[PDB]
Write a protein that binds this ligand. Structure first.
Ligand SMILES: CCOC(=O)c1cn[nH]c1
Length: 182
């Protein structure tokens, strides 16, 4: 409906796949080459389904900060025959607060879903499902089961992936440029 939704749609159309693990279906953001991200609670194994294609996982790493605290981001390298558009230049370099963010989801349950979530707080520490977590972004929208892995964007920036909610607020794990240097 406006430039927020336009950027979000462009990221969804070229840089997302539907990932299925034994824990469910997730929006999965492709970042560059065969490298993508997914919430760590997806419990990625040796094999994953990507748009219903059986796919070998070449490498997977659950990120933690240098305090050895969960970040809830798993980086996956996929044995896929096609590279993602490189979007690393849209990733923030530093922890920050944001205005006017969109959360976008694409699954069998929620196809072509875009939610204007508004102001995004650098929340920091969250006890996420009992697990102490750092670098959490917070927004005031009642997000639901099925939106995890959803991409959080502003105009011109890909800032996080949805990892949970409490019924009133939603929470995303930050994406930072430094995660994807090669
Ligand atoms: C289909 C209706 O959707 C909602 O009301 C919603 C989705 N997430 N949070 C609220």
């Amino acid at each position: 409906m406006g430039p927020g939704f336009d950027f979000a749609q462009a990221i969804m159309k070229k840089n997302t796949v539907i990932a299925r693990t034994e824990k469910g279906e997730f929006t999965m953001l492709g970042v560059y080459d065969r490298v993508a991200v997914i919430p760590t609670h997806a419990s990625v194994g040796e094999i994953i389904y990507i748009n219903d294609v059986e796919t070998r996982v070449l490498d997977a790493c659950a990120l933690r900060d240098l305090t050895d605290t969960n970040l809830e981001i798993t980086i996956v390298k996929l044995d896929r025959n096609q590279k993602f558009r490189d979007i690393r230049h849209f990733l923030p370099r530093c922890e920050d607060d944001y205005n006017d963010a969109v959360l976008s989801v694409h699954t069998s349950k929620f196809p072509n879903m875009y939610i204007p979530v508004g102001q995004v707080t650098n929340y920091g520490f969250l006890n996420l499902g009992g697990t102490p977590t750092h670098r959490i972004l917070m927004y005031n929208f009642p997000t639901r089961a099925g939106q995890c892995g959803g991409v959080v964007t502003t105009t011109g920036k890909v800032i996080g992936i949805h990892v949970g909610g409490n019924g009133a607020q939603g929470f995303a794990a930050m994406l930072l440029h430094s995660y994807f240097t090669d």
